[PDB]
Amino acid sequence: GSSGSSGRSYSCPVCEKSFSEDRLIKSHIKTNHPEVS
Ligand SMILES: [Zn+2]
C-alpha cells in the first residue's frame, strides 16, 4: 500500500530472497536454482 521507497536492488524472484552484492544473486540462482527458473 504505502508507496515511498524504491531504488536499484536485486531481488530473487525464485526464493523471494535478497542479497547484498549484485554478483551473489546471479551465482546464487545459478547454483541454488539449477532448474527452478
Ligand atoms: Zn533464490
CB 9, CB 21: distance < 8 Å? no
> Cell for 21?
552484492
Asked if the structure places residue 15 within a domain, the reply is yes
Asked if the structure places residue 2 within a domain, the reply is no
- Give 27 Cα–ligand 1 centroid separation in angstroms: 9
CB 37, CB 29: distance < 8 Å? yes
Asked if the structure places residue 3 within a domain, the reply is no
Asked if the structure places residue 1 within a domain, the reply is no
Sign of CA dihedral 2, 25, 13, 15: negative
- Give 36 Cα–ligand 1 centroid separation in angstroms: 9
Asked if the structure places residue 16 within a domain, the reply is yes
Domain total in the chain? 1
Asked if the structure places residue 21 within a domain, the reply is yes
Rg (CA), the chain: 12
**Closest to 19 measured CA to CA, from 9, 33, 34, 7:** 9
Domain of 18: which CATH number? 3.30.160
DSSP 18: E
23/1 Cα distance (integer angstroms): 30
Asked if the structure places residue 4 within a domain, the reply is no
12 is in an annotated binding site: yes
Amino acid residing at 32: N
3 is in an annotated binding site: no
15 is in an annotated binding site: yes
**Domain enclosing residue 21, as ranges:** 10-37
